[PDB]
Structure 1
Amino acid sequence: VTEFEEGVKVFMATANGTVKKTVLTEFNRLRTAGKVAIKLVDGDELIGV
């Protein structure tokens, strides 16, 4: 990400064909330990953002 601006969204696609959309401004500032962004189930992993 070059910079955070406007109200663009983030598209997340995992295995088994599950999609999810979230606003970028949520990830504007993060601490040393990050926050939960997706509730994965069983053996599922993010493949594309």
Structure 2
Amino acid sequence: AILPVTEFEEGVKVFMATANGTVKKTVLTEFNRLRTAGKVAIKLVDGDE
């Protein structure tokens, strides 16, 4: 659905996500440092959003 771009991850950079159903959440980028094809979830998107 959405692919943002990141130059290099940093210390206190806070990641901001926002769904089509008018619901938003803010997450810390340090929990996305090295996934390795890892299907880590971010939100419990309710319904079709």
Give the TM-score of the pair, scaled to structure 1. 0.29
Greater share of strand residues, 1 or 2?
1
Q: Structure 1: where are the runs of 5+ without partners? A: none
Q: Where does residue 34 of structure 1 map in the other structure?
A: 38
The answer as to whether partners of 2:18 and 2:25 remain within 8 angstroms in 1 is no
Are residues 40 and 14 of structure 1, via their aligned partners in 2, closer, same or farther at CA, if it must alter by over 3 Å? farther
Q: Structure 2: where are the runs of 5+ without partners? A: none
Runs of 4+ more than 4 Å apart: 5-16
Q: Offset of 1:30 from its aligned partner? A: 2.5
Give the TM-score of the pair, scaled to structure 2. 0.29
Q: Offset of 1:19 from its aligned partner? A: 2.3
CA–CA distance in 2 between the matches of 1:2 and 1:41?
23
User: Once superposed, what is the RMSD of the aligned Cα atoms?
Assistant: 3.7
Q: Offset of 1:34 from its aligned partner? A: 2.4
With CA pairs under 8 Å and 6+ residues apart, which has the higher RCO, 1 or 2? 1
